[PDB]
Design a protein around this ligand. Structure first.
Ligand SMILES: *C(=O)[C@@H](NC(=O)Cc1ccccc1)[C@@H]1N[C@@H](C(=O)O)C(C)(C)S1
Length: 640
């Protein structure tokens, strides 16, 4: 029995080499090719495993219940159960047999064909048939398509039917001007190594009406992924790309001929959208007659996925950004339905999934405005909109008297001389400032003084009631919002700067809409929701209902008062409660400071909608407030 455990070592090493993909090392562990030993030579074992297991994409061989006994003086039979993963799913409970051999001191395996699959007999063969699964669709809250599959018109040229000289140059220029293409692009496409003169060289996926086709230009219909909104929802939806051999090596249940989501919801929901491949993996005898069916099941097309997004609101929010750096989040704050998740600038997902140029992708990747960023999921300093939270906390703990009038002289203020040359600044030199005036003019000095009077302890008690440090249950990659880098400010300056939303605060636009939902639910925070069929989740008693009834009327004056920072929104004539903001960041590139514009707004009458828009590294005189009129009209009209 001292050699039985040595044989179990070799059997465990044999299945480990098969599991590791090292078919040569597993073939070295066999004995001699005889009549009652190995049924094939060593190099022939490498080929049989590499051909069969490679055809079925066998990966992850796991064994169980190993029993090594004694049959003769030189024969030690063994048996075990095993399972493996193939391109058609998991192949379970496979009963393997065989024998072992040990002549001198080394123990080897008597290789037999049944060590590839249980029922193999000599010249038996393996067949695999597969059928691709159609990818599921991504639809909005009203069934409108966001990521679907349709017929695409592919433009291409046959180098033979172009010409020989001069006529070929003229026909290239005719196609170049008829479809907005570079003459260097056509000549570089038809001059690649794969191009034959009679081949169809694809050029561009045209989306509009088909123009007049010059000589050599033909258009073929191909089926592929299509995004009706395009740039307007590229960061959220994402794109699909060709599946590589490395993707198959990681997950053999993928379709080697299909597409895989590379970013956005296409990647986050890739398993539900891609479905399962159908087909049959069978063993045949030498005659090709089906012997045993190992795996067989029919194709299951991918599921559709309905989002809370409004396709009309998504396009309106994105176009309102005018192609500048920024983002916009629109919700129904009583339920959390994310109506829009726009990010700008953006990339073309249709061009991305239909083959993109190396320089076109380089332009996206090296654009300093970085269109690949999902800005609705990137943490920012919230700015002056965060004063709503600081005021609500000060009202709940009794620190802020809504009618107490602070006397503030000038535009700069500091606690005492220990602050050095640093001072909190404001923009409006208003002498008599209470809570309402502080919100109308957005007074940092008022909030900084109220935050310092409140103290870090009471401030964090109110802050910890929100969603700082929480992972939102959303299919979007994001980091939790943070109050500061550490659990303590350890600085009166940092405490005051946090008071008006300008410390180490990092809150992405989606998390901001979650925190700000308390002003539309009487102090109840409603978590955002992207999947339509999801259940509404909320947190009770985040802030007091009294604070809501005090701040929201003041937020109406931010729009209605003639000196309110959002007074331009009064032109709409709709019930609006808003709060603006402008944060300052230090971008060491140009060294001159950069500014982020912010806007929070919702309907205080029906609580039907709520939006949080922002501009990153805004241009002078540009703001989110001057861009929200069109989106506010649509949300007020359709969401009450
Ligand atoms: C909140 O964001 C506040 N911002 C500042 O104090 C910084 C700042 C940035 C640019 C110019 C001047 C001051 C206040 N709220 C913003 C706003 O609501 O847009 C103001 C610019 C009114 S100051």
């Amino acid at each position: 029995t001292q050699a039985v455990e040595a044989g179990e070592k070799t059997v465990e090493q044999f299945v480990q080499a098969l599991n590791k993909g090292d078919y040569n090392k597993a073939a070295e562990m066999t004995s001699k090719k005889a009549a009652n030993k190995s049924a094939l030579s060593e190099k022939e074992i490498l080929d049989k495993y590499q051909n069969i297991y490679g055809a079925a994409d066998v990966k992850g061989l796991q064994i169980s219940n190993l029993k090594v006994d004694k049959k003769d003086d030189s024969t030690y039979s063994f048996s075990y159960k095993a399972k493996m993963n193939t391109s058609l799913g998991e192949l379970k409970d496979l009963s393997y047999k065989g024998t072992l051999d040990r002549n001198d001191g080394q123990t080897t395996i008597n290789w037999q064909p049944n060590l590839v699959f249980p029922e193999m007999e000599g010249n038996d063969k393996v067949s695999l048939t597969t059928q691709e699964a159609a990818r599921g669709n991504i639809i909005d809250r009203n069934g409108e398509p966001l990521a679907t599959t349709g017929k695409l018109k592919q433009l291409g040229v046959v180098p033979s039917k172009l010409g020989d000289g001069g006529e070929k140059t003229a026909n290239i220029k005719a196609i170049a001007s008829s479809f907005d293409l570079t003459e260097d692009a056509i000549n570089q496409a038809i001059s690649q190594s794969w191009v034959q003169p009679d081949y169809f060289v694809p050029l561009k996926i045209i989306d509009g009406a088909t123009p007049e086709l010059p000589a050599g230009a033909t258009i073929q219909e191909v089926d592929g992924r299509y995004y009706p909104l395009g740039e307007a929802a590229a960061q959220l939806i994402g794109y699909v790309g060709d599946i590589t051999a490395e993707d198959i090596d990681k997950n053999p249940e993928l379709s080697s001929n299909g597409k895989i989501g590379r970013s956005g919801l296409e990647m986050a929901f890739d398993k539900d959208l891609r479905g399962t491949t159908g087909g049959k993996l069978s063993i045949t005898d030498a005659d090709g007659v089906e012997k045993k069916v190992l795996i067989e099941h029919e194709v299951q097309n991918g599921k559709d996925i309905k989002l809370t997004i409004d396709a009309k609101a998504q396009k309106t929010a994105f176009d309102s950004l005018g192609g500048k750096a920024g983002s916009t989040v629109a919700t129904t704050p009583k339920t959390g339905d994310l109506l829009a998740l726009a990010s700008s600038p953006s990339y073309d997902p249709n061009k991305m999934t239909n083959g993109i140029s190396q320089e076109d992708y380089k332009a996206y990747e090296e654009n300093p405005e970085q269109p690949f960023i999902s800005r609705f999921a990137t943490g920012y300093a919230p700015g002056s909109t965060f004063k709503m939270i600081t005021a609500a906390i000060g009202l709940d703990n009794g620190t802020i008297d809504p009618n107490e009038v602070l006397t503030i002289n000038g535009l700069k203020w500091q606690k005492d001389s220990s602050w050095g040359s640093y001072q909190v600044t404001r923009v409006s030199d208003v002498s008599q400032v209470d809570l309402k005036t502080a919100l109308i003019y957005s007074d940092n000095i008022y909030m900084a003084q109220e935050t310092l009077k409140m103290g870090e302890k009471k401030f964090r008690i109110g802050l910890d009631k929100f969603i700082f440090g929480e992972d939102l249950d959303l299919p979007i990659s994001m980091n939790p919002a943070q109050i500061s880098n550490e659990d303590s400010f350890n600085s009166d300056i940092l405490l005051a700067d946090t008071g008006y939303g300008q410390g180490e605060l990092l809150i992405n636009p989606i998390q901001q809409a979650a925190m700000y939902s308390v002003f539309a639910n009487n102090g109840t925070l409603v978590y955002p929701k992207l999947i339509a069929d999801k259940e509404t989740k909320d947190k009770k008693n985040v802030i007091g209902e009294t604070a809501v009834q005090t701040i929201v009327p003041d937020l109406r004056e931010v729009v209605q008062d003639v000196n309110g920072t959002a007074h331009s929104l009064s032109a709409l004539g709709i019930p609006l409660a808003a709060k603006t903001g402008t944060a300052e960041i230090k971008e060491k590139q140009d060294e001159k400071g950069k500014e982020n514009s912010f806007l929070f707004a919702f309907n205080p009458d029906n609580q039907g909608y709520m939006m949080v828009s922002m501009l990153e590294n805004k241009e002078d005189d540009d703001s989110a407030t001057k861009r929200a009129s069109e989106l506010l009209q649509y949300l007020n009209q359709n969401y009450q």
